[PDB]
Amino acid sequence: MKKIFMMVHELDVNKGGMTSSMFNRSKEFYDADIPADIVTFDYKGNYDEIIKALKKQGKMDRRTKMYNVFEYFKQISNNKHFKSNKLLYKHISERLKNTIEIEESKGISRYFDITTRTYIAYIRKSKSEKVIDFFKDNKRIERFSFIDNKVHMKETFNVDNKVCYQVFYDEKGYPYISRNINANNGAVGKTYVLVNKKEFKNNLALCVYYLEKLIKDSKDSIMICDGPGSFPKMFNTNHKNAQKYGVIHVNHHENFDDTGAFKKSEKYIIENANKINGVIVLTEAQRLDILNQFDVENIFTISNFVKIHNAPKHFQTEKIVGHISRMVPTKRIDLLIEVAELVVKKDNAVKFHIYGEGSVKDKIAKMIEDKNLERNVFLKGYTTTPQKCLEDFKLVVSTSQYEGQGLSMIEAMISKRPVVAFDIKYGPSDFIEDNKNGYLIENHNINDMADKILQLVNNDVLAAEFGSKARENIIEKYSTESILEKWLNLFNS
Ligand SMILES: CO[C@H]1O[C@H](COS(=O)(=O)O)[C@@H](O[C@@H]2O[C@@H](C(=O)O)[C@@H](O[C@H]3O[C@H](COS(=O)(=O)O)[C@@H](O[C@@H]4O[C@H](C(=O)O)[C@@H](O[C@H]5O[C@H](COS(=O)(=O)O)[C@@H](O)[C@H](O)[C@H]5NS(=O)(=O)O)[C@H](O)[C@H]4O)[C@H](OS(=O)(=O)O)[C@H]3NS(=O)(=O)O)[C@H](O)[C@H]2OS(=O)(=O)O)[C@H](O)[C@H]1NS(=O)(=O)O
Ligand SMILES: O=c1ccn([C@@H]2O[C@H](COP(=O)(O)OP(=O)(O)O)[C@@H](O)[C@H]2O)c(=O)[nH]1
Ligand SMILES: CC(=O)N[C@H]1[C@@H](OC[C@@H](O)CO)O[C@H](CO)[C@@H](O)[C@@H]1O
């Protein structure tokens, strides 16, 4: 009866909390006999390989389907032919016939016509990927992109060598979508779906049509929008019965802002709460802040579902401080390096294991070296097994300035690893009980945080006691039953 469609930009293998919560939410709805699938809107040439990898890793439940806008029309297109598009491949081969090949490296080569003496093509082969750039009067006109020698995309270039047009090709090499690209901002213009002879004014129009085709207009159909920038796709559909929910995963205020500004995407979701079935926030404090600040009522608090597995059989007695996150500015890993410097200057035995990848990773690497912490702080890369990494840590640290909730802190507490976190909006004070299951540090206070890490790393009994109470607190306050009943209460009203 009930079926759920959870919307986000894309799915990939080295992501953070938002997709992690969608994957766990899907598992919980399927266990309660409610199919809950993921709808994505990006274009990938190898989506089938991403899905298999996420499922093999155990991140994505085997029952979770991913519905993708390009995949839907590509699959319709695949059914149209039996034979591969031999003529497109013959056309490409003919344009390279009667040329001079000039090799630059392995995989890289250039082609010059024997008669016109001019530069025809550039080919770059790396692994399973191939790119063929064609030229006219020493200017790049087009690029054909291949995966396992099969064309998947053609891009056209303007005078400034910027993308002005794209064509997507199915599994047999036939075009199924063609679209204009505004080279000034990279936005998608008029899109033509060759397979059904339908044209759309832009990508949002295509995505709105797609959702109306995918999701039947029944009260049993439930749309949950997780990706904030994706909210207009769900919001603009013509559904009269299907339910619409927006989940806000972050602090709705603008990050690194003293003017009090609100994030644009989240502001649009909140302001439109009364026009949909509900806008979900992860903590009670955010719901109250929103209600005080905005003229809306449809704000509901529903925590992320929590996966309570078995606690690691042994406590880490070694001075290992862990940190598992997306390496992004809001996590303030620079403050963690500054804290590490203080902890290491009072105790040189304490190790800091930092997992993840992101924009700040290089800045942080240079920062450890400049502070000469290369013997104590280790950038361990992304982990597909955070639960196993958690066993190696004595405690976990959070210098993050903004959260919606904080699954890594919650995950550490489930593995009996106490958290030392800056008391920020939102999340830490909901689950950390200061001096009972961890420590809540006054925001920016790097000295008091360094002091609490030192007390904790050098006290085996306190570290074990805090961790034990931490798992107990999560089990008690984040039951799957109460969270599922909160969602069911909305779906049934
Ligand atoms: C006239 O042009 C002007 O308006 C149009 C829209 O109006 S129109 O309909 O009249 O044409 C604007 O075009 C639209 O918006 C563009 C844009 O916002 O850039 C663009 O949207 C697409 O691309 C965005 C960027 O993609 S990215 O892959 O390069 O980042 C994308 O938004 C991004 O979403 C990701 C995400 O959710 O994955 C965000 O990343 C964040 O979350 C990740 C996942 O979380 S997790 O925890 O790991 O699981 C994290 O990994 C990541 O660290 C984190 N980044 S962080 O900074 O928050 O820490 C990322 O920040 C976003 O940028 C869009 O996805 S969406 O869900 O937001 O919709 C995506 N839309 S899609 O292609 O349809 O999927 C498009 O060109 C267009 O989108 S639209 O929906 O088709 O309308 C146009 O820009 C504007 N030009 S302007 O006026 O000059 O500014
Ligand atoms: O190397 C890494 C880094 C992050 N994560 C996961 O990404 C999520 C991060 O969640 P959180 O809410 O703490 O922060 P967010 O990424 O949403 O900003 C957690 O479930 C982590 O286990 C992971 O699996 N491996
Ligand atoms: C930094 C931040 O606010 N992250 C939140 C969010 O992640 C997604 C964020 O990338 C979207 O831009 O979602 C997680 C799961 O709900 C929260 O636990 C987490 O706090």
Residues 6+ apart with CB under 8 A from 16: 325, 326
Q: What is the Å distance from ligand 1's center to 229 Cα? A: 6
Does 462 share its domain with 483? no
Does 299 share its domain with 434? no
Q: Are 362 and 369 in contact (CB under 8 A)?
A: no
Does 22 share its domain with 91? no
Q: How far is CA 62 from CA 27, 70, 72, 259, 385, in A?
A: 9, 22, 20, 45, 17
Does 391 share its domain with 456? yes
How far is it, in rounded angstroms, from Cα 282 to Cα 267? 16
Does 330 share its domain with 415? yes
Q: What is the Å distance from ligand 2's center to 489 Cα? A: 28
Token digits of residue 251: 């602090």
Give the ligand whose atoms come closest to the C-alpha of residue 304.
Answer: 3
For the chain, how far is it from start to end, CA to CA, in angstroms?
Answer: 16
Q: What is the Å distance from ligand 2's center to 382 Cα? A: 10
Q: Are 407 and 17 in contact (CB under 8 A)?
A: yes
How far is it, in rounded angstroms, from Cα 408 to Cα 413? 9
How far is it, in rounded angstroms, from Cα 46 to Cα 175? 17
Label each residue of the chain as H, E or C.
Answer: CCEEEEECCCCCCCCCHHHHHHHHHHHHHHHCCCCEEEEECCCCCCHHHHHHHHHHCCCCCCCCCEEEHHHHHHHHHHCCCCCCCHHHHHHHHHHCCCEEEEECCCCEEEEEECCCCCEEEEEEEECCEEEEEEEECCEEEEEEEEECCEEEEEEEECCCCCEEEEEEECCCCCEEEEEEEECCCCEEEEEEECCCCEEECCHHHHHHHHHHHHCCCCCCEEEEECCHHHHHHHHCCCCCCCEEEEECCCCCECCCCCCCCECHHHHHHHHCHHHCCEEEECCHHHHHHHHHHCCCCCEEECCCCCCCCCCCCCCCCCCEEEEECCCCHHHCHHHHHHHHHHHHHHCCCCEEEEECCCCCHHHHHHHHHHCCCCCCEEEEECCCCHHHHHHCCCEEEECCCCCCCCHHHHHHHHCCCCEEEECCCCCHHHHCCECCCEEEECCCCHHHHHHHHHHHHCCHHHHHHHHHHHHHHHHHHCCHHHHHHHHHHHHHC
Give the ligand whose atoms come closest to the C-alpha of residue 426.
Answer: 3
- The CA angle 376-377-380, to the nearest 5 degrees, is 130
Strands 3-7 and 36-40: parallel
Q: Return the closest-CA partner of residue 484 out of 28, 21, 26.
A: 28
CATH of the domain at 451: 3.40.50.2000
How far is it, in rounded angstroms, from Cα 328 to Cα 338? 16
145: Cβ below 6 Å to ligand 3?
no
Q: What is the Å distance from ligand 1's center to 72 Cα? A: 21
Does 47 share its domain with 123? no
Does 48 share its domain with 165? no
Q: Are 236 and 16 in contact (CB under 8 A)?
A: no
Q: Structural domain of residue 259, as residue ranges? A: 1-81+202-309+479-493
Strand order across the 66-68 sheet:
66-68, 36-40, 3-7, 221-225, 243-247, 278-281, 299-301
Tell me how many domains the chain contains: 3
Count CB atoms within 10 A of the CB of residue 440: 18
Q: What is the Å distance from ligand 2's center to 324 Cα? A: 6
Q: What is the Å distance from ligand 2's center to 407 Cα? A: 7
Count CB atoms within 10 A of the CB of residue 72: 16
Give the ligand whose atoms come closest to the C-alpha of residue 357.
Answer: 2
Q: What is the Å distance from ligand 1's center to 215 Cα? A: 23
Phi then psi dihedrals of residue 361, to 5 deg: -45, -50
Token digits of residue 147: 């995966």
Residue 435 β-bridge partners:
none
Q: Return the closest-CA partner of residue 194 out of 74, 280, 91, 369.
A: 74
Q: Which of 9, 10, 15, 18 to probe ligand 3 with, by most ligand atoms within 8 A of CB?
A: 18
Residue 275 β-bridge partners:
none
Does 14 share its domain with 56? yes
Q: Are 441 and 448 in contact (CB under 8 A)?
A: yes
Ligand 2 environment, Cβ below 6 A: 16-18, 20, 324-326, 355-356, 382-383, 386, 406-408, 411
Domain final residue pick, 201, 218, 249: 201
Instruction: Check the CA dihedral 43-45-48-49 and report its sign.
Output: negative
Whose alpha carbon is nearest atom 2 of ligand 3?
403
Token digits of residue 386: 């955070």
Does 371 share its domain with 427? yes
Give the ligand whose atoms come closest to the C-alpha of residue 330.
Answer: 3
How far is it, in rounded angstroms, from Cα 109 to Cα 128? 16
Domain final residue pick, 201, 231, 260: 201
Q: Are 401 and 255 in contact (CB under 8 A)?
A: yes
Residue 454: exposure state from Cβ atoms within 10 A (0-12, 13-18, ≥19)? middle
Amino acid in position 301:
T
CA 106 to centroid of chain Cα atoms? 34
Ligand 1 environment, Cβ below 6 A: 9-10, 15-19, 41-42, 185, 187-188, 202-204, 207, 227, 229-230, 326, 328
Q: What is the Å distance from ligand 2's center to 310 Cα? A: 19
Does 323 share its domain with 456? yes
Does 369 share its domain with 275? no
**Residue for token digits 């530069």?**
119
Residues 6+ apart with CB under 8 A from 400: 325, 330, 331, 332, 406, 421, 422, 424
**Residue for token digits 């969602």?**
487
Q: How many residues does the chain have?
A: 493
Q: What is the Å distance from ligand 1's center to 185 Cα? A: 12
Q: What is the Å distance from ligand 3's center to 439 Cα? A: 21
Does 348 share its domain with 456? yes
402: Cβ below 6 Å to ligand 3?
yes
Q: Are 393 and 417 in contact (CB under 8 A)?
A: yes
Nearest ligand 1 atom to the CA of 42 is 75
Helix 460-477 with 446-457: angle, nearest 10 deg = 110
Domain final residue pick, 180, 201, 222: 201
Give the ligand whose atoms come closest to the C-alpha of residue 403.
Answer: 3
250: Cβ below 6 Å to ligand 3?
yes
Nearest ligand 1 atom to the CA of 188 is 77
